[PDB]
Amino acid sequence: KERENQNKFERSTYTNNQTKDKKLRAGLKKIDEQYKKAVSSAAATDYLLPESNGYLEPENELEKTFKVQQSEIKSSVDVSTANKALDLSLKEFGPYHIKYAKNGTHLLITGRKGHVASMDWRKGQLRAELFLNETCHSATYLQNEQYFAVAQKKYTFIYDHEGTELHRLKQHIEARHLDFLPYHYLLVTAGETGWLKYHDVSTGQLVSELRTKAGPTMAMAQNPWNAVMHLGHSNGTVSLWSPSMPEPLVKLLSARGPVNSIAIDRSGYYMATTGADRSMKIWDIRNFKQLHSVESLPTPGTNVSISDTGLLALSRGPHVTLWKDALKLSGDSKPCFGSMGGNPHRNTPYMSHLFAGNKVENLGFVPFEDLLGVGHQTGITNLIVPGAGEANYDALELNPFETKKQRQEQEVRTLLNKLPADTITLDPNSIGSVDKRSSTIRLNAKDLDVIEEALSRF
Amino acid sequence: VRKLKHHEQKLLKKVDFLEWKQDQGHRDTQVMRTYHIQNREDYHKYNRICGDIRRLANKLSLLPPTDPFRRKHEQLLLDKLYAMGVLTTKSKISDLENKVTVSAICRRRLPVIMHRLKMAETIQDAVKFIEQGHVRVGPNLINDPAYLVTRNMEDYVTWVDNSKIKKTLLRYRNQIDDFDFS
Amino acid sequence: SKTRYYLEQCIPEMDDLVEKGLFTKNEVSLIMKKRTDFEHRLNSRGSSINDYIKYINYESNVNKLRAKRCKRILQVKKTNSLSDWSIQQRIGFIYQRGTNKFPQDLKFWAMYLNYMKARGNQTSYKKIHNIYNQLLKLHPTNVDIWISCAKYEYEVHANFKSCRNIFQNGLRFNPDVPKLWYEYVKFELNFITKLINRRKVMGLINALRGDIALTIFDVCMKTLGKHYINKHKGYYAISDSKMNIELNKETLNYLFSESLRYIKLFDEFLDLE
Amino acid sequence: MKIKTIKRSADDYVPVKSTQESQMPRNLNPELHPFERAREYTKALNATKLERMFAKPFVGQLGYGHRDGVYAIAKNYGSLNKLATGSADGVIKYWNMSTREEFVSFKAHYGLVTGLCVTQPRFHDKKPDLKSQNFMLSCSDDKTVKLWSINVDDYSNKNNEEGLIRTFDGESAFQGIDSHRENSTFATGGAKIHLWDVNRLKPVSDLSWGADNITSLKFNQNETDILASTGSDNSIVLYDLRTNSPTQKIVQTMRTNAICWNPMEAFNFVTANEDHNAYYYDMRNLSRSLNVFKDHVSAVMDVDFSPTGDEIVTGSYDKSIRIYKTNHGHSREIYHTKRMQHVFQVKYSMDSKYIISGSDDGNVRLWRSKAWERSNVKTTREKNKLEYDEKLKERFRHMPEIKRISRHRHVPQVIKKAQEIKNIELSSIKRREANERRTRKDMPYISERKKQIVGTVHKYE
Amino acid sequence: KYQSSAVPFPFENREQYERSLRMPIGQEWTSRASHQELIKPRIMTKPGQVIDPLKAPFK
Amino acid sequence: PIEYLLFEEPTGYAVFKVKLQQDDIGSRLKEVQEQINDFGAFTKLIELVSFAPFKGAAEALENANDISEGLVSESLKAILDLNLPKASSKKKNITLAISDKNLGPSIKEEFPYVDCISNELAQDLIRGVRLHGEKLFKGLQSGDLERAQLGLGHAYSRAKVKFSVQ
RNA sequence: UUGAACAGAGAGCAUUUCCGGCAGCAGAGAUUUCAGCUGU
């Protein structure tokens, strides 16, 4: 009943800053008993969890972890993971924006010149290779490998599984950043115009057009927790947006200069933003505190990414550098680059790699595996990062081994339980409650000159 | 996407992944499958022209019917749209909203007049021939299918000489002269 | 899914089995992933009684390892907590599930009965009675189950009344195999021999005869003759009197050969008259 | 340097043999499953919409009805599918509700058959054959109570003189009848309420409070020796058969059309009366109703309890029936039909799943108590989905978007217009009593549950 | 419109009412046993047999 | 309540135990009428508790004639006395569902504590187990049921017509 | 409606009546488990 890992499974509630009703008293007592039983029994599943997370540990004081080479990892790990660590050398079209499907089964690469390829990177099956000879910028899958949206010269296009064009969106005028919201079925679009557009993929209907009013959108990320969009502008300002409010939900002053990249944890708690002022900044999202401010990077961080197990992958051109346990509150988790004299209270890099020829275009962790796919000027490279993936997925949220029938039925079922775009709030648990107006107690309709003293009476 | 069940047809009806409201019935896709347009955005760079001529025909309708600036510019526009062959006659200015079509401004393209005067036998083979570089309007070769013609140049659409399909039709009719090198 | 239900029914015993400091978390995760494999193979499609048998063998092996580790770590022979009966209860439930799914392999039914009998004082003889009742309901014609049921309830419990009831019900169901007749006359001779030997013993310390065996001998001859004349010449009596007398002679040969075997294994009961 | 990556191994996740299903590993992290309020809000909304499209409650009418409108119905409390109905032209019929067809019809009387019930007649000379004969008895305004037997094909044990085994006789007319659930006894109300048993041809006892007639009668179902009756002086009288006497009566404002006792609580009953609502009364304290079920718009003609005791059905003179949860006090459901006129009798079948209504055009109709509920047997996946959806609609019940959908029905034009003028009338009288209370000194706050009792014999202390 | 207008009847304040709503009963968020305990209804009848009135041990 | 079910068939006798009652009032409805066609829901109603197979084609023909003319044979007596609980004869008999309204009297003549039902509910329960057949029996019979049906039909017909091969 | 003896079912409910403690010893089945006496 005690369960040393309950507070992961606990659930916050409302507080005022007991009752005389017998029936209501016993009803609330049954509700508290059921909540305790449910938390305990849900937290006892960690026995049933099949796999264990990966790691790499130094076992010596001369053996630092950032100086461990990718060939040495590929020798030290098994043949299946060594074959997952792919490398495509696609030289002639531009730097390749990488994208993985939400289970790690499909890869979607876009060249800057025109070359968009959707493929099953772990078999050898490509299912779309289309050369759209205008400058493409980004792409994403929608709810499947079966549809993907590409952001072209101006218009965003939507292609089916084999690459036939389904849609040319006449809105979404100049996208540079696309991201799909999978529980809400919303393709979110931002770019050189100062506008943020939410487009419902299922109905086909443009849900929202929002003026950023801050020029072109330099970075864009999605909170996986509550589906609000963090856009980074040329002010050094991140703004958190929802498709209901025509104003940003929050505006944070992250950096000086512009904001080069944003990444959010999948728990929706931490956000790493890199500015062009050579400054990485780790942010608390829920309480909006600034946790860490790594200033004076040697060159501006062009990308950040956060794995499912909380690694932090920063990329500064040729270099990729990953820190472990950097998204924590304490000042001993501030990511350093060296430990001055061997200080154990300095978060040196967990591992680093140098793409010596080129400058990396973007970063993306492969979802349920221990790999980091970085797309760069001459194609794709996966890196075996051992701490970097949820070993125990849930197979009824999203399954890496899913079949054709399972894809069909899961598509219909998630389409059926698509969440409305109005339910996107800054916290997800605020659509069962009562208003923050409409008084917290329910109402019971019962509650619904001594002369002048004489001259008074006149 | 799954040919949904009945409680399914009822629960969500406006869902349609294939055809949205702003597709306008996919008329761009339909007319470029008809007249076989190579790249995208040709439809909309014709539709901007259609919208511009109906907008300035609207504001020429706005101006009073007596001034020579208005009447000279509407007869000039009508004669230029006759001279590029978008129309077939010099009729009413009501035809500048009834008869100007993105279809007809595709009818003046070079492969479709080629199929019209039976130089090719289908518009696809016409685009085959003019990407292979066989035809010319007057002196100069035509490489792209986006060159639409005017009303004067439907008479000098001819192949080049040394075009071997011209040589095959000459030796079909065995009028094949070879002093003229084709 | 129901594999999820069974797998999370398995968790309190390993709660207790980690608290009693004999197993660790990394090895109990290994026994849970093996048990996950087995539960999924059990309640998925295309299932096999060999999947059931291998699950029972795995659960008995982890029970023996648990007992060995308990004696080596805690130096007690049972912790008197949940984790010393839960796994035998699991084996009994795997047996019950398997016999409900494939009630056709008497090898598995008899492995169930053997494990349930050999469980010892912890089981209940009415729990053995229940699975004897449903097994005899499903296989009334298979006669070795009747012999085994009556043999368990006489040669272990010495319940003469219930043993007589079992033999009379079996002879009601299949009064055609002579083996059940011979085991009934064997049981009645054993019962009357134990009766007269307890008489001799009470005499030496301090009416009801083999006529029961003779009467069941008489009805054995009569009904075995009736069932052989009904079994052979099967459909109709379309046979002339040569074939009828040939048949009746052969049934006399059959029945008299069985009575020859009756006297041949009747002589060795030499403690009664 | 030690090193370990994720080894997925493909034997645990995609099965070896093709005949068996794939493994579904779970991981109960809320990080893995993010939108836990919105996702089950949308499942509760899709459950309410699925209920509003699956609500097909009309099963079927049974037989061809009667000729002159059904004024009496009685289920038998031991068999599931048998039903006796009588009309205004004196014909009674016994029904098999499985095949929806009459076992037998009977020209029983000449007037209206004003009551009928069913019996297991404890004769002490004969033995009742209840496996092949059913027994219904029935009183009319031609001063007769007649007892009939029915040949029933439900067991195939046997292989016969069906109708009218005896004829009780009164001097004045009868108006209601109900049978005791043991000991050969019944009671008939009329010009005066008499008790009878099936052996004697005359009333055992006359149990009348005063010289005011009795319009309806119900025996209790447990504590079977407690009777209740409705008299046309707007009176509800309780009788006890140990003391062989009346017990206590109350006088209300308007006339109680019917009673039914709670089969699970044994001292609670529900009255159905002429101001358009029903009253849930405790026998041990009749000074206050313990519920009022309000949503009807004309006089409530008949009420009945679910055999689970948890909900009531209530048919009224506006041509519609209404089902009420017992703890709420407003209608959970309304059933209407353009063909159904003036529902005079409603019973709740012993399955607790179907509702029998007898209208006055002639027809007796079956309905589902839960409209969206089908009667097949269910695999565990669909049974789990259905009770998950019930719990989810329950805990999101009061959200405005799903409340406006679950609250929605199509009511006829006449009932809708009567409902809205009833609303503006009630709002006007609340406005005027608020003004009068603002001025005057001592205006007592009378409860709604007491606002309909004009008085009570044997006062409470 | 995704949050209720006032506090519904059986509760007295929104702390009580949101303590009712604080745990999801879904398959994805509870174990299988807890999911079954949370979704079994209060009234469970048998689907084809008669329900008799209650009888008590001597009232 | 339809508690037990007796299905006669050429391989022997089967006693099933009714788990869930089907609906009585909604017995003519569409879902109730096609749940006996779906096997995944019929196995929620019917469970096999016993199957006594015959001793051969001779006892098969004897029991086919006894079932045909509505009599309880000795194998019927054995399997019913094994399977049905010793209920009372005056209060709440055990309920057996048969398909033959003139075999019922022969069953109550031998077991007075058994009331027998063959109305439309027992009829469609019986035709559910006829429709599914070999799937309900879980593998426990020798001999294919249709092959025994061919043999028993030919034997019954030649007996009824007195077919002589002389 | 009760009482009596008889035949039972495994389908319910208590509670300190004993056992799931240790040997010595013979017995049981295939070197492991199984079955009772004298005291802790």
Strands (E), D99-213: 101-107, 113-119, 133-140, 144-151, 166-169, 174-179, 185-190, 194-197, 205-206
Q: What stretch of H or E contains A81?
A: helix A79-84
Retrieve residue D390's tokens. Answer: 């019930």
Closest C-alpha among D340, D408, D381 to residue D52: D408
Spatial distance from the CA of F115 to the C1' of G7 (Å): 24
Q: Is there a contact between D105 and D114 (Cβ–Cβ < 8 Å)?
A: no
> Are the beta carbons of A269 and A263 closer than 8 angstroms?
no
Sign of the four-CA dihedral D283, D287, D292, D296: positive
Instruction: Tell me the two tokens of residue A329.
Output: 């509150």
Residue A401 contacts residue D22 (beta carbons within 8 Å): yes
d(CA D431, CA D400): 27
Q: Cβ neighbours of residue A444 under 8 Å, at least 6 residues apart?
A: none
Task: Pick the residue of A61, A80, A103 with the most D CBs within 10 A to test the interface with D by mutation.
Answer: A80
- Distance separating alpha carbons of residues D305 and D311, to the nearest angstrom: 6
Is there a contact between A223 and A238 (Cβ–Cβ < 8 Å)?
Answer: no
Which pairing describes strands A371-376 and D70-75: parallel, antiparallel, or unpaired? unpaired
Centroid of chain to Cα C252:
34
Cα–Cα distance measured from residue D109 to residue D141, given in angstroms and rounded to the nearest whole number: 9
D442: phi then psi, degrees, rounded to nearest 5: -115, 85
Close Cβ partners of C50 (under 8 Å, ≥ 6 residues apart): none
Nearest residue in E to D385, CA atom: E39
User: Would you call C79 an interface residue with chain F, using a CB distance cutoff of 8 Å?
Assistant: no
Strand partners of residue A294? A280
Instruction: Report the alpha-carbon distance of residue A116 to residue A99 in Å, rounded.
Output: 11
Flag whether residue D131 sits within 8 Å of chain F, measured between CB atoms: yes
Instruction: Give the number of other CB atoms < 10 A from CB of residue D172.
Output: 12
Report yes or no: A50 at the C interface, CB cutoff 8 Å. Answer: yes
Measured over the CA atoms of residue F92, residue F95, residue F101 and residue F105, the dihedral's sign is: negative
The shares of helix, strand and coil residues in chain B, as percent rounded to the nearest 5, are 50, 5, 45
The C-alpha atoms of residue F126 and residue F117 are separated, in whole angstroms, by 11
Reference C96, options C83, C109, C84, C85; nearest CA is: C109
Rounded to 5°, angle at Cα D387 from D384 and D391:
135
Token pair of C161 as six digits: 């009344």
Closest residue, CA to C1' of G10 = C126
Query: Smallest CA–CA separation between A209 and chain E, in Å?
Result: 21
Whether F82 sits inside 8 A of C173 (CB atoms) is: yes
Return the residue of C nearest to F50 by Cα. C138
Phi, psi torsion values for A270, nearest 5 degrees:
-125, 150
Give the gap in angstroms from C-alpha A244 to the nearest C-alpha of chain B.
21
Q: Which nucleotide's C1' sits nearest to the alpha carbon of C124? A: G10
Spatial separation of the C-alpha atoms in residues D445 and D460, rounded to whole Å: 20
Buried/exposed D267-301: b ≥16 CB within 10 Å, e otherwise: ebbbbbbbebbbbbbebeebebbebbbbbbbbbbb
Single-letter code of the amino acid located at C126: K
**CA neighbor of A167 nearest in space, from A195, A205, A122:** A205
Nearest residue to G8 via alpha carbon and C1'? F86
- Cα–Cα distance measured from residue E26 to residue D34, given in angstroms and rounded to the nearest whole number: 12
Task: Tell me the residue length of chain F.
Answer: 166
Q: Which residues contact D131 (CB under 8 A, 6 or more apart)?
A: D152, D154, D155, D157, D158, F115
Distance between CA A238 and CA A229 in Å, rounded?
Answer: 10
Q: Is C12 on the interface with E (CB under 8 A)?
A: no
Chain F residues touching residue D153 (CB < 8 angstroms): 119
Of B148, B111, B149, B152, residue with least CA distance to B131: B111
Question: Could you tell me which residues come within 8 angstroms of residue A334 by beta carbon, excluding any fewer than 6 positions away?
Answer: A292, A294, A326, A346, A347
Nearest residue to A184 (alpha-carbon basis) of A145, A225, A156: A225
Please name the method used to determine this structure.
cryo-EM
Which residue is closest to A44 within chain C, CA to CA?
Answer: C11
Taking contacts as CB-CB distances below 8 angstroms, the residues of chain E near A21 are 12
Nearest to C185 by CA among C92, C238, C264, C87: C264
* Residue D351 to residue E50, Cβ atoms within 8 A: yes
A324: its two tokens: 């472990």
- Provide the 8-state DSSP code for A421: G
Cβ neighbours of residue B38 closer than 8 Å, sequence gap 6 or more: B127, B145, B146
Q: In angstroms, how far is G1 C1' from D183 CA?
A: 14
Instruction: Please give the resolution of this entry in Å, rounded to 1 decimal.
Output: 12.3
C27 touches chain A (CB under 8 A): no
E49 interfacial to chain F (CB closer than 8 Å): yes
CA of F108 to C1' of G8 (A): 23
Q: Which amino acid is at E37?
A: E
Residues 6+ positions from C30 with CB-CB distance below 8 Å: none
Structure tokens that stand for B137 in this block? 């309007």
Preceding residues of all breaks in chain C (C to N beyond 2.5 angstroms)? 206
Chain A from 408 to 437: CB within 8 A of any B CB: 408, 411-412, 415-416
**One-letter identity of residue A147:** Y
> Residue D39 CB: number of other CB atoms within 10 A?
22
**What are the Cα distances from residue D274, in Å, to B138, D270, D297, D412?**
100, 13, 10, 21
